[PDB]
Amino acid sequence: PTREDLVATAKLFIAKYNEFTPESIISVRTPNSVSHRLFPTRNATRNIGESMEACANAKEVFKSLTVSVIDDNDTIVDERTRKVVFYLASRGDTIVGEWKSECIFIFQMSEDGKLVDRIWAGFDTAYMDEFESRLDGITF
Amino acid sequence: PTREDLVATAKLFIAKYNEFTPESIISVRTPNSVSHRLFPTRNATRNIGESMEACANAKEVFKSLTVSVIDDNDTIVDERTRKVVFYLASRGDTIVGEWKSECIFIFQMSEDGKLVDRIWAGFDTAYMDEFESRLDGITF
Ligand SMILES: COC(=O)[C@@](C)(O)C(=O)[C@]1(C)C(C)=C[C@H]2[C@]3(C)CCC(=O)C(C)(C)[C@H]3C(=O)[C@@H](O)[C@]2(C)[C@H]1C(=O)O
Ligand SMILES: COC(=O)[C@@](C)(O)C(=O)[C@]1(C)C(C)=C[C@H]2[C@]3(C)CCC(=O)C(C)(C)[C@H]3C(=O)[C@@H](O)[C@]2(C)[C@H]1C(=O)O
Ligand SMILES: [Ca+2]
Numbered sequence: 320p321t322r323e324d325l326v327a328t329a330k331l332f333i334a335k336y337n338e339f340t341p342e343s344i345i346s347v348r349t350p351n352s353v354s355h356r357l358f359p360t361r362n363a364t365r366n367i368g369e370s371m372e373a374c375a376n377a378k379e380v381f382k383s384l385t386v387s388v389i390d391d392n393d394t395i396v397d398e399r400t401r402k403v404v405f406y407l408a409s410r411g412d413t414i415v416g417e418w419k420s421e422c423i424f425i426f427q428m429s430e431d432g433k434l435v436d437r438i439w440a441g442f443d444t445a446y447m448d449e450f451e452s453r454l455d456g457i458t459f
Numbered sequence: 460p461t462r463e464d465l466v467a468t469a470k471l472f473i474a475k476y477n478e479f480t481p482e483s484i485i486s487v488r489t490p491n492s493v494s495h496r497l498f499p500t501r502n503a504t505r506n507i508g509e510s511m512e513a514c515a516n517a518k519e520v521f522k523s524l525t526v527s528v529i530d531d532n533d534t535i536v537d538e539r540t541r542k543v544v545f546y547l548a549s550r551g552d553t554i555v556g557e558w559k560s561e562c563i564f565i566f567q568m569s570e571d572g573k574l575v576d577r578i579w580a581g582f583d584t585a586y587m588d589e590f591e592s593r594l595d596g597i598t599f
């Protein structure tokens with residue numbers, strides 16, 4: 320797969336991610352793919368089934384959620400390891416107020432370049448902690 | 460510059476980073492180089508002079524620092540943009556005890572591949588907040 324092939328798959332992943340349904344967030348992934356969350360305070364690993372479960376749980380909190388590659392000039396592509404790095408803006412509305420953050424996604428594509436075989440995601444963990452404290456403070 | 464050229468310069472940057480003096484942390488950088496932070500919550504941008512001063516400040520807290528590539532197999536190299544990505548463990552001896560975290564470093568090398576022209580660093584921002592809370596607890 321060419322540099323452009325790898326980026327196109329990563330951009331398709333993002334397109335389907337922004338549909339934000341359990342069906343759509345798996346639709347550009349290999350079935351044995353795992354999704355890693357970077358940094359010790361938020362470290363986690365999710366297979367396809369756990370990813371769909373996480374998406375459905377997020378949908379209980381997020382009324383909407385969109386991510387966008389901020390600048391294609393930031394994008395990093397390693398043709399030899401079939402990896403693409405995006406730096407993304409994430410934006411949404413939730414039951415505890417606005418979500419606004421940025422994150423780094425690393426994709427490793429399948430051998431044919433057409434699917435995401437592994438994901439690593441680096442979030443703003445302090446922001447996640449603040450958001451969780453808003454969730455943890457729900458009262459009626 | 461080849462793939463091996465780029466990794467070598469990045470690895471030299473890390474070695475001199477771990478020496479952790481104001482001169483050593485700029486020794487592998489171009490004169491106009493800029494260091495960026497990823498993530499809104501600890502967003503900072505520093506030129507050479509600002510990086511030296513920040514090192515001197517940090518040395519008041521960090522007695523010793525070691526960042527190390529966790530897995531060379533995870534390293535990302537983009538020959539076209541001259542970029543290298545490391546996922547690093549960070550380990551520190553500080554005035555409030557042990558520092559232990561992980562971070563992602565992105566380097567963009569100069570045209571000849573011998574210096575670091577631009578740096579982006581993604582830290583565990585929740586852990587940075589936890590550490591500052593430890594610092595703010597110093598009691599005589
Ligand atoms: C961590 O990588 C991911 O985003 C994916 C590829 O693993 C996901 O499919 C998951 C299920 C999806 C759809 C969304 C994220 C978020 C809700 C996206 C918005 C966010 O920035 C936050 C940090 C709130 C995300 C998460 O909490 C993510 O852990 C999930 C739920 C994500 C997952 O796999 O962890
Ligand atoms: C990404 O770190 C860098 O490249 C720079 C330009 O920000 C730096 O030179 C500084 C001076 C250096 C040497 C170290 C960092 C750290 C102490 C590295 C270890 C860390 O994990 C932490 C997060 C505690 C770092 C920081 O706090 C950084 O602010 C500094 C001290 C960094 C700087 O301030 O610029
Ligand atoms: Ca639920």
Ligand SMILES: [Ca+2]
Pocket residue numbers: 451455
């Ligand atoms: Ca909680």
Ligand SMILES: [Ca+2]
Pocket residue numbers: 591595
């Ligand atoms: Ca303080």
